[PDB]
């Protein structure tokens, strides 16, 4: 008999899995919400804000009607190279969130030392991708890398239709803190990472007023062979593609139809993405420059590093947020950790209902979320930034590992407002002026110099309908 080769590998479940990390795809966990689990690993946080800064280059009339298409193509070109590096070095890309890629090497505690070596080598090779590259002489096609290691907690929350996850804990706090200390082309190790690492491999320098360290060089011992060392480390990498599948970047490319698994995984993915996956919408439909209103919600906790403490609070907040968003067709685009808690990137369509009505609705939704989340046990501070304007939307990343993302000046503005104006609902001038709501529903705020955003215009607090608050 003939032996035709080439198994079909383009199933809906495989396409869904491109949007998720191995942590979820192979997770097999409890139906209970919140769900918490605990493990150890090494985290890499790659700041790609230099790449996402290109939303401004591609807003130019020079791109004719194709700024969104050109942006996603160039972003995917460079980001795919980073993703391939992480995956070939055995990492799991957790999230494209906050203008960054967060990756994880989950391993037993005894193996953290050797895996830190693999992750440092990966980080240096990521920098190596961008060694020559630049054409606009601006926006900066370079990256900053923070690494951390230690205890990691995972939180899964959601309802019967939708699921989200977060990784939480001191290593998570440390990885974003380490990346913030980095200059372009730097690799910064968290204090615990530097405590746990193989010091014979590397030369470091101190970071002033910090216990974190900068990697100057990876200079291994004379008899060291990285390929042989990496092969040894793969013993501890559960899902590293191997044998017949050593040509694949992800084991998830081998997933076969399994209705129970697909039912679980689709909950993490937006319905408009599933429509495209099902070939019920054109593959290019979601790459666009569109007017939206961003509602960015920040929840602060005393113990942002402890999942048992914050998990029920996030679940409770999520159940309310999703009910408020449902009424006015808002979406949660992303959930991710900041230094003191949990950020929800919510998005409304701006011409989904016209002029004063939609902007009024986004403000009213913001206040509703603010009032409910303020009364959630263990939520210490709620802060909400509301900003309206043109953003880039699209599926960004590699063929095998990509996520729908929203980027642009107005996303960055809503994110900074919720940090610089904590404890209140704030909005930009487009939202304030557009809502046509009476002026006494607001308070004009003192101007702040917010790192990363320039010429913000007047900002306002949404005080609400009465003198209350």
UniProtKB/Swiss-Prot annotation:
Belongs to the adenylyl cyclase class-4/guanylyl cyclase family. It is linked to Hypercalciuria absorptive 2: A common type of hypercalciuria, a condition characterized by excessive urinary calcium excretion. Absorptive hypercalciuria is due to gastrointestinal hyperabsorption of calcium and is a frequent cause of calcium oxalate nephrolithiasis. Residues 42-179, 293-418 form the Guanylate cyclase domain. Mg(2+) 2 binds at residues 47-48, 99. The gene is ADCY10. It is found in: Cell membrane; Cytoplasm, Cytoskeleton; Cytoplasm, Perinuclear region; Nucleus. Hydrogencarbonate binds at residues 95, 167, 176, 337. ATP binds at residues 47-52, 99, 144, 406, 412-416. The N-terminal guanylate cyclase domains are required for enzyme activity. Fragments or isoforms containing the first 470 amino acid residues are fully active. Cleavage may occur to generate the active 48 kDa form. This is Adenylate cyclase type 10. Catalyzes the formation of the signaling molecule cAMP. May function as sensor that mediates responses to changes in cellular bicarbonate and CO(2) levels. Has a critical role in mammalian spermatogenesis by producing the cAMP which regulates cAMP-responsive nuclear factors indispensable for sperm maturation in the epididymis. Induces capacitation, the maturational process that sperm undergo prior to fertilization. Involved in ciliary beat regulation. Mg(2+) 1 binds at residues 47, 99. Detected in airway epithelial cells and testis (at protein level). Weakly expressed in multiple tissues. Expressed in brain, heart, kidney, liver, lung, pancreas, peripheral blood leukocytes, placenta, skeletal muscle, stomach, thymus, airway epithelial cells, duodenum, jejunum and ileum. Very low level of expression in bone. The chain holds residues 1 to 469 of 1610 of the full protein. It comes from the Eukaryota.
């Amino acid at each position: 008999m003939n032996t035709p080769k080439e198994e079909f590998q383009d199933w809906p479940i495989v396409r869904i899995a491109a949007h998720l990390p191995d942590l979820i795809v192979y997770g097999h966990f409890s139906p209970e919400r919140p769900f918490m689990d605990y493990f150890d690993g090494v985290l890499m946080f790659v700041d790609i804000s230099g790449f996402t800064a290109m939303t401004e280059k591609f807003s130019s009339a020079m791109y004719m009607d194709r700024g969104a298409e050109q942006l996603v193509e160039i972003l995917n070109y460079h980001i795919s190279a980073i993703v391939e590096k992480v995956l070939i070095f055995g990492g799991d890309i957790l999230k494209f969130a906050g203008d960054a890629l967060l990756a994880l090497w989950r391993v037993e505690r005894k193996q953290l030392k050797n895996i830190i070596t693999v992750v440092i080598k990966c980080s240096l090779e990521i920098h190596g991708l961008f060694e020559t590259q630049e054409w606009e002489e601006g926006l900066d096609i370079r990256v900053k890398i923070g690494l951390a290691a230690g205890h990691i907690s995972m939180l899964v929350f959601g309802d019967e239709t939708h699921s989200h996850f977060l990784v939480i804990g001191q290593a998570v706090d440390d990885v974003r803190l380490a990346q913030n200390m980095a200059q372009m082309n730097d690799v910064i190790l968290s204090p615990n990472c530097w405590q746990l690492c193989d010091r014979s491999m590397i030369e470091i320098e101190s970071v002033p007023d910090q216990r974190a360290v900068k990697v100057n060089f990876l200079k291994p011992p004379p008899n060291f062979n990285f390929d042989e060392f990496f092969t040894k480390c793969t013993t501890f990498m559960h899902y590293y593609p191997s044998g017949e599948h050593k040509n694949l970047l992800r084991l998830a490319c081998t997933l076969k139809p399994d209705p129970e698994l697909e039912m679980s995984l689709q909950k993490y993915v937006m319905e408009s993405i599933l429509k495209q996956i099902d070939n019920k919408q054109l593959q290019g439909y979601l790459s666009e420059l569109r007017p939206v209103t961003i509602v960015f919600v920040n929840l602060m906790f005393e113990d942002q590093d402890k999942a048992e403490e914050i998990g029920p609070a996030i679940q409770d907040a999520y159940m309310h947020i999703t009910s408020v968003l449902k009424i006015f067709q808002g979406q949660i685009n992303k959930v991710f950790m900041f230094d003191k808690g949990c950020s929800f990137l919510c998005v409304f369509g701006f011409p989904g209902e016209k002029v004063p009505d939609e902007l009024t609705h986004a403000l009213e939704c913001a206040m509703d979320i603010f009032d409910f989340c303020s009364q959630v046990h263990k939520i210490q501070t709620v802060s909400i930034g509301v900003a309206s304007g043109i953003v880039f939307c699209g599926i960004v990343g590699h063929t095998v590992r990509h996520e729908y993302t929203v980027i642009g000046q107005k996303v960055n503005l809503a994110a900074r407002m919720m940090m610089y104006y904590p404890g209140i609902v704030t909005c930009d001038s487009v939202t304030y002026n557009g809502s046509n709501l009476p002026a006494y529903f607001f308070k004009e705020l003192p101007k702040k110099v917010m790192k990363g955003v320039a010429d913000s215009g007047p900002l306002y607090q949404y005080w609400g309908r009465t003198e209350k608050v």
